[PDB]
Design a binder for this molecule. Structure first.
Ligand SMILES: *[C@@H]1O[C@H](CO[C@@H]2O[C@@H](C)[C@@H](O)[C@@H](O)[C@@H]2O)[C@@H](O[C@@H]2O[C@H](CO)[C@@H](O[C@@H]3O[C@H](CO[C@H]4O[C@H](CO)[C@@H](O)[C@H](O)[C@@H]4O)[C@@H](O)[C@H](O)[C@@H]3O)[C@H](O)[C@H]2NC(C)=O)[C@H](O)[C@H]1NC(C)=O
Ligand SMILES: *[C@@H]1O[C@H](CO[C@@H]2O[C@@H](C)[C@@H](O)[C@@H](O)[C@@H]2O)[C@@H](O[C@@H]2O[C@H](CO)[C@@H](O[C@@H]3O[C@H](CO[C@H]4O[C@H](CO)[C@@H](O)[C@H](O)[C@@H]4O)[C@@H](O)[C@H](O)[C@@H]3O)[C@H](O)[C@H]2NC(C)=O)[C@H](O)[C@H]1NC(C)=O
Ligand SMILES: *[C@@H]1O[C@H](CO)[C@@H](O[C@@H]2O[C@H](CO)[C@@H](O)[C@H](O)[C@H]2NC(C)=O)[C@H](O)[C@H]1NC(C)=O
Ligand SMILES: *[C@H]1O[C@H](CO)[C@@H](O)[C@H](O)[C@@H]1O
Ligand SMILES: *[C@H]1O[C@H](CO)[C@@H](O)[C@H](O)[C@@H]1O
Ligand SMILES: *[C@H]1O[C@H](CO)[C@@H](O)[C@H](O)[C@@H]1O
Ligand SMILES: [Ca+2]
Ligand SMILES: [Ca+2]
Ligand SMILES: [Ca+2]
Ligand SMILES: [Ca+2]
Ligand SMILES: [Ca+2]
Ligand SMILES: [Ca+2]
Ligand SMILES: [Ca+2]
Ligand SMILES: [Ca+2]
Ligand SMILES: [Ca+2]
Ligand SMILES: [Ca+2]
Ligand SMILES: [Ca+2]
Ligand SMILES: [Ca+2]
Ligand SMILES: [Ca+2]
Ligand SMILES: [Ca+2]
Ligand SMILES: [Ca+2]
Ligand SMILES: [Ca+2]
Ligand SMILES: [Ca+2]
Ligand SMILES: [Ca+2]
Lengths: 411, 414
């Protein structure tokens, strides 16, 4: 019927309006009829000065405590006249004034966002509480300047607006494990009121980096007489990831052809012998060590073992042709034809054989490791009844191995 | 002079005719006491000088006399005594397929994550074969499957190894693990087989966001519920397992106004954090979010409607009052009063009563505004005074009452 508007939190005793003038009767009538104003329920904000016919405040009106969310804030008062009994209805509209700053319930919010999160994905954040409404309510959301994210204020929901976080640039834990941002709520009033809170984003480690080997190739040499438990070479790999995505499993791939006496440890990556070696049998070993991640990522390296020849085999002497007894007057007579063989390699397999120089016999080097023992020129029967001959062959290895065979020739 | 014979040929078999090839008669060989000599190890060959023939003495094993090195050639020197003469002859052993492809491990374990991209290659152990060339491993086949296929790489100095290739993406949610049969095919005729079991274990990754059982929750709670009261329990399920399957629950209240609601991360139980009041807040709307330990999230809406309990009794206020009433006054007004009830529904609807026998009656002027008045002129002599008691009561359950007593003295003008 009759509505007057006044701002919120107006000081007590302030004049609201002229009731007598607007309603259409003299002050004398109000004084005579003992006019009194009554709010129907709670405490009365208004007083009616009947001496002047004016309507003024008694108490400071708080919008957020008398209306709250409901808008517009209108209070209903009934002014009464005694004789005759008469009622007039008057309404008081409280204008909202920005007397509350946006504030966040929690000082800091923790977020866990996995490394493998795709861009344009949206996250929901807690909102700043504001008692005020309309233009005096929360109107904007701004985040501290950063490369990865940006903040968008969504005006959804029945009332007010909430903050949403949007990702534009893909995340990587290897560069930044965690990020820290400053979230600020800006009021719509003039001047705006601030409200800050800390946003803590924790990047979750995922398996996106394959284990890589420190060294691409390993070349190590091992003697053929090494014990069964001997450390050949230890290979290692590093993973950029952490946790179960950072643990590395080592397994070996031997060559397609021929079994190998090598075994590797899953954890340490130590390559040890699983059997005995032999340079004469296998001169070289080539294999590939693979490091598989606990997720599935793998990195491969090549390992080449060159065995070292040890002079473990002594010269072998074999008799091809021999003459049990020798003539007396035979010139350039051939006693025996023998050969030497050495399975070892290098100068360990090169042989030299010797005989007593005092003896009339001499061996002539015929072919490759092929010699013939013979007597040069005629011999005497009376002078020598018999000959015990022992030829001793030795290699040029380290150490030197010797072999001797005894033969007795009767002239 | 080189002669060729297959590996593992039975002892005593004739290798070749030396006399013919070298170019002299058998008699010369017999006369000179011709003897054949292997330079080093045991001798496979024997030279029968009675026929001038060359024959085996022992069964030749390629893999034990040559091994990897090819061609397998043995060097012999044949000797003639008088005069002393040397002729060099060589024996080439042809490899025969007498070894079946075999795998070192009976079964191989692979771990391939669910998020594995197609065309990615994995390395598998190779089947060991003693033979070489065409008699070695020549082909690799895998048991027919939807996801993978096998490719044989001819890398390494010798022979070829098996590689596994992925063509169709993997999902742990459909199939947790796969089992395949790897077979190594020899090149010889007929080919020899060699099988092994391949077990692929798919590793769980975070690719499924937690989803809520019900999109919306409607629950009602009285305004006088204790601080520790179970309002509603919300739950969500995650397809993933392990840490990718664990769910964290947190609530989002409205932008405006604080709420007395608190949520548990684990149980998803929404409980009161304070007291309620229907007169203050009639409705609550919030959003429950389920965040994964990886970062994936699922959202639902929860709306709680509080129920008004008739906890407030009617309030009676006197606006205007007259202590005493004239004698011959017609329709005289004793008082003007009002009633107020903060409750809602029939809990806030009020009815007020007075003794009907009394001449006075209350007239309903406005909404919960009444005026007490006397019906007709009154007489002084009959009644010196009146005890009046107005009783106002709401229509709620239970009914709350409030009463005010006023005593009016009817006085004549004189
Ligand atoms: C290694 O072995 C695999 C499979 O081995 C087979 O299975 C084992 C158990 C043995 O039985 C082997 O004998 C088998 O070969 C080979 O891969 C595939 O082999 C299959 C054989 O069935 C091929 O499928 C066939 O494709 C035919 C179509 O061929 C058309 O094109 C050719 C081109 O030359 C032409 O000649 C022909 O006339 C057709 O026009 C089809 O008709 C037939 O029914 C059958 O389905 C398949 O194509 C082979 N795939 C590949 C990728 O090779 C490998 O070839 C083998 N590798 C070697 C020997 O090196
Ligand atoms: C003015 O009149 C009122 C109303 O009394 C009625 O009207 C008068 C004209 C007569 O006709 C009375 O007979 C009528 O009852 C008087 O109020 C009454 O007071 C008496 C004395 O205390 C009450 O009687 C007692 O009440 C005790 C308490 O009752 C309470 O509980 C009931 C519900 O169970 C509740 O309604 C009431 O308001 C009390 O809260 C009780 O323990 C005791 O046994 C006895 O019954 C009588 O109940 C009152 N009336 C009513 C309607 O309750 C005023 O006293 C009187 N004025 C003066 C100055 O005396
Ligand atoms: C929130 O406040 C900012 C002021 O910091 C408004 O300005 C935006 O950002 C910069 C200011 O540094 C301007 O250069 C841009 O042009 C503004 N962006 C847009 C989209 O206009 C920003 O507009 C405010 N947000 C809202 C929703 O009003
Ligand atoms: C709110 O207040 C802060 C200071 O507390 C300002 O930095 C901001 O711009 C806004 O005015
Ligand atoms: C918001 O940010 C300010 C600094 O800009 C702090 O002082 C305040 O406590 C809140 O964290
Ligand atoms: C060896 O033998 C298997 C059966 O045992 C065959 O499937 C294979 O193709 C090869 O002939
Ligand atoms: Ca205020
Ligand atoms: Ca305000
Ligand atoms: Ca504000
Ligand atoms: Ca990365
Ligand atoms: Ca990794
Ligand atoms: Ca990572
Ligand atoms: Ca050796
Ligand atoms: Ca050696
Ligand atoms: Ca030697
Ligand atoms: Ca063999
Ligand atoms: Ca063979
Ligand atoms: Ca074979
Ligand atoms: Ca999946
Ligand atoms: Ca999940
Ligand atoms: Ca999964
Ligand atoms: Ca209440
Ligand atoms: Ca209530
Ligand atoms: Ca009530």
């Amino acid at each position: 019927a009759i509505r007057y508007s006044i701002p919120e939190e107006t000081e007590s005793g302030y004049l609201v309006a002229h009731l007598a003038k607007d309603l259409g009767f003299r002050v004398g009538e109000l004084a005579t009829r003992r006019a009194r104003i009554h709010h129907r329920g709670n405490k009365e904000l208004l007083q009616l000065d009947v001496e002047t016919g004016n309507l003024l405040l008694k108490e400071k009106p708080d919008r957020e405590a008398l209306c709250g969310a409901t808008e517009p804030c209108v209070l209903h008062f009934q002014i009464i006249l005694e004789n005759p009994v008469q009622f007039f209805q008057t309404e008081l509209q409280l204008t909202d004034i920005n007397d509350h700053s946006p504030e966040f319930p929690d000082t800091e919010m923790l977020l866990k966002i996995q490394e493998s999160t795709q861009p344009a994905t949206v996250f929901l954040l807690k909102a700043a509480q504001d008692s005020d409404i309309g233009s005096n309510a929360v109107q904007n959301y701004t985040v501290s300047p950063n490369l990865h994210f940006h903040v968008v204020t969504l005006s959804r929901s029945d009332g007010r607006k909430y903050p949403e976080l949007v990702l534009d640039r893909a995340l990587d834990r290897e560069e930044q494990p965690e990020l820290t941002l400053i979230l600020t709520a800006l009021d719509g009033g003039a001047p705006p009121k601030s409200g800050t809170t800390t946003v803590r984003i924790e990047v979750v480690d995922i398996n996106d980096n394959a284990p890589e080997f420190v060294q691409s190739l390993y070349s190590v040499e091992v003697p053929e007489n090494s014990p069964l438990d001997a450390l050949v070479v230890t290979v290692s790999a590093r993973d950029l990831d952490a946790g179960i995505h950072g643990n590395v499993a080592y397994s070996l791939f031997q060559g397609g052809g021929g079994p190998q006496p090598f075994v590797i440890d899953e954890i340490t990556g130590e390559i040890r012998l699983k059997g005995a070696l032999d340079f004469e049998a296998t001169s070289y070993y080539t294999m590939e060590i693979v490091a598989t991640d606990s997720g599935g990522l793998s990195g491969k390296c090549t390992v080449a073992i060159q065995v070292l020849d040890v002079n473990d085999n002594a010269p072998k002497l074999t008799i091809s042709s021999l003459t049990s007894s020798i003539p007396e007057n035979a010139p350039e007579a051939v006693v025996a034809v023998f050969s030497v063989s050495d399975p070892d390699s290098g100068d360990n397999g090169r042989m030299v054989c010797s005989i007593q120089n005092e003896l009339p016999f001499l061996l002539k080097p015929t072919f490759e490791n092929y010699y013939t023992l013979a007597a040069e020129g005629p011999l005497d029967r009376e002078i020598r009844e018999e000959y015990n001959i022992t030829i001793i062959v030795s290699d040029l290895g380290t150490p030197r191995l010797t072999t001797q065979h005894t033969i007795t020739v009767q002239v």
